[model samples]
Target chain A: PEIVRHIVFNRYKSQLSQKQIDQIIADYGNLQNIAPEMKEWKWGTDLGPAVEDRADGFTHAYESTFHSVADFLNFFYSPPALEFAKEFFPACEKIVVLNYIINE
Target chain B: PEIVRHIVFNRYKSQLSQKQIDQIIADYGNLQNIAPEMKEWKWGTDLGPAVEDRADGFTHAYESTFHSVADFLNFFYSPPALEFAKEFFPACEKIVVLNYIINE
Candidate 1:
């Protein structure tokens, strides 16, 4: 049930990727270098990131990704992720699925 | 080739249409009475599927319905729609005349 919703937004950067994303957070400024998991979300150049967010700095990213809808459901339910998010960045939000092709 | 891009956002109203939309725009500060295209965009409720945008209060609407992309092309080119929009909103935004579609 996971869905592939494309992201759309103009950014300050010409390019970015999942790993770079993490790196951006880690370095927080003038940064690079990131984790392997960070690299998992593929970045793009041709058409722009396939996902995006509403915040000011979310330059290149996906709408939100998932292996399946069930995966997404489970992700929201993850105990540590929830606790960490709730306590830490509070605004550090969980991604949510925006759309799915209808059965009709 | 009007593309039907459904809209998603939370809002002040529970219902609206193309005519109603136009009417809403015309009323400025809504007391009553309006046009038809104003009520064009259908609003919704339920397991929110289909489409949405980056904004918070858009509540309900389509992704922008399309008869086909071609129809969309023609609309941007239309004269009156262009002129009136340009003069009124400057910041009012003329919905931009765009020209692009891939053959592939």
Candidate 2:
């Protein structure tokens, strides 16, 4: 079976307060409960370090794993996900999202 | 203790044959053996599906984990890494690199 990892990088707007940021993170983490298709979930704050100047100002990373492409797509279009994005997208100054099929 | 995940997305030049791309991937995987500082390594081809049209053009993703910032910096500047990058960077049309401190 193949596994797909949905990866996201977010750079929040400069004016947002720490409390606002924490709430956003918490809301994202809660998505695991709402979407059973997610096999695994993990996230973190950018460490502000890299081999090259490639961090590109993104300050957070979130990863969600799914067993199949269908599951991933279902979760992506689910009501819970759509609702979350309404708040998530506007708070971010920039966002990068990518998905990969796990080799193992 | 904090764990950092060094994440990379690579979009190879359009003209390279499949063999060249596979060799580049193999060479990257081999870096785990040469750089003892890398605590973990994983790489895969892009799944080509995302929540939004945010994947850009990157077709591959590689992730390396390290226990400390010093180890990551050491591996980044290591002879083997430098040599590998000499070949890796030129083959790619574009690359995105980011590091994050794992929340758990």
Model 1 DockQ reads 0.07
Q: Write the per-residue lDDT of candidate 1 for residues A4-100, one digit (tens) a residue.
A: 3322222333344556545543332111122111112323222112211222333222222344445544544555435543432322332222333
For model 2, how does the per-residue alpha-carbon lDDT over A59-104 read when each residue is reduced to its tens digit?
Answer: 7888888988888889989999999989999998988788877762
Residue-level lDDT for A92 in candidate 1: 31
Task: Give Cα-based local distance difference scores for all models.
Answer: 0.31, 0.82
Question: Per-residue lDDT of B59-101 in model 2, one digit per residue for the tens?
Answer: 7888888998888888888899899889899998988788877
Cα lDDT tens digits, model 1, B6-99, are: 2222233334455755543443212112211222233232223323333322222222233444444354345644554453233221121111
Model 2's CAPRI class is medium
Error of 2 at B67 (Å): 1.7
